[PDB]
Amino acid sequence: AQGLAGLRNLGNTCFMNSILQCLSNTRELRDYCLQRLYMRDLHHGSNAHTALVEEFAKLIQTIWTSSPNDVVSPSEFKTQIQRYAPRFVGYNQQDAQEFLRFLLDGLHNEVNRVDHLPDDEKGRQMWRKYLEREDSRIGDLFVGQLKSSLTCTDCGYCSTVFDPFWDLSLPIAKYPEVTLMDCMRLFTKEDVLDGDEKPTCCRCRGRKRCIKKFSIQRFPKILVLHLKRFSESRIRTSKLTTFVNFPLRDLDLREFASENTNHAVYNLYAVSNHSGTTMGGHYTAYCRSPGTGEWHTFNDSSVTPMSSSQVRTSDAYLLFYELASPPSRM
């Protein structure tokens, strides 16, 4: 159908509704539920756990078989996510990306299929070793691979490690406006590790000044960008309301790649917004419909149309991007 169903607030659960709608409008994750491909991936025999995935899929199936102006209650799903993640027991407001990390962790767990080399091959081998422990249809969408290059300024050896990632938490490159590209450049900027942040260089056998640099070895099909909208002031968390100018189309991240290879352009399809103060704020979601390409505002039980020129606001907290196809020949 149209998937324009609202989600009832069960008590400061707008953070949950916001993430649920972003996932509901993640096309391949939604089709995973609607086509019931998750049934073939659920585990059987002893020590199997399936209730979280089953209730998540039933909720997604309910959203995309409902009529317009319908309000769905995700109370049974909340029972399962809080069983898996006890942080969400009760009815206090939570952080949407903390909820996203725990939810995707539980969904992926219940459908899991459970030196001498150049940099590229070492990255490929470290990826295979990760897939020996984590490999699911959900991980096939979100997981990328970060490359961290640490060069000792004394001996010049560049130590490289490859960390998988399900999302990227980007610092706000604070200044009225800041672009998303600026936040990516700060994340990938060379970091001088000196003073008491000098790491141990095993070659030099001592603490040395080193230069650390992030790059992206593998780009995921779904790239989730989490904006670090906080500063710390005397033990008190303070929200950063700085307007971040992120694009709706043609987010080109080829310059942040480990190897200059072009398959790395994204288009926006969902945004999770946090408005208000650091505590007592409110969560909404702007989601592009996969079938029609039209944007809608999801504010708990209320779903209304919106223009694409209304999606980019200062409340954007999590950005959901999908990888575009490489350039067509002729």
Binding site: D95, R133, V161, F165, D191, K228, I235
Partner: protein, 76 residues
């Protein structure tokens, strides 16, 4: 078996931690408070898509040398 891991702070700069694989997450959060002044109950550490939970060790998450933990707070 001591190793250096990194924590990406709120500004993007990394701090360096001297740790053992058997070090608990609260031990790691105690060191981050000494350098960043963020109480442990406010810190959230992300690695490979997982949020590090208190009662566990670094080895439980397969955190190796020179890996990077990503520090984030909470919007509520």
């Amino acid at each position: 078996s001591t190793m250096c891991i990194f924590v990406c702070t709120l500004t993007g700069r990394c701090i360096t931690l001297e740790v053992e694989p058997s070090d608990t997450i609260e031990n790691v959060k105690a060191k981050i408070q000494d350098k960043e002044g963020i109480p442990p109950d406010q810190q959230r550490l992300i690695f490979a898509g997982k949020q590090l939970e208190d009662g566990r060790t670094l080895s439980d998450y397969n955190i190796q040398k020179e890996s990077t933990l990503h520090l984030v707070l909470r919007l509520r």
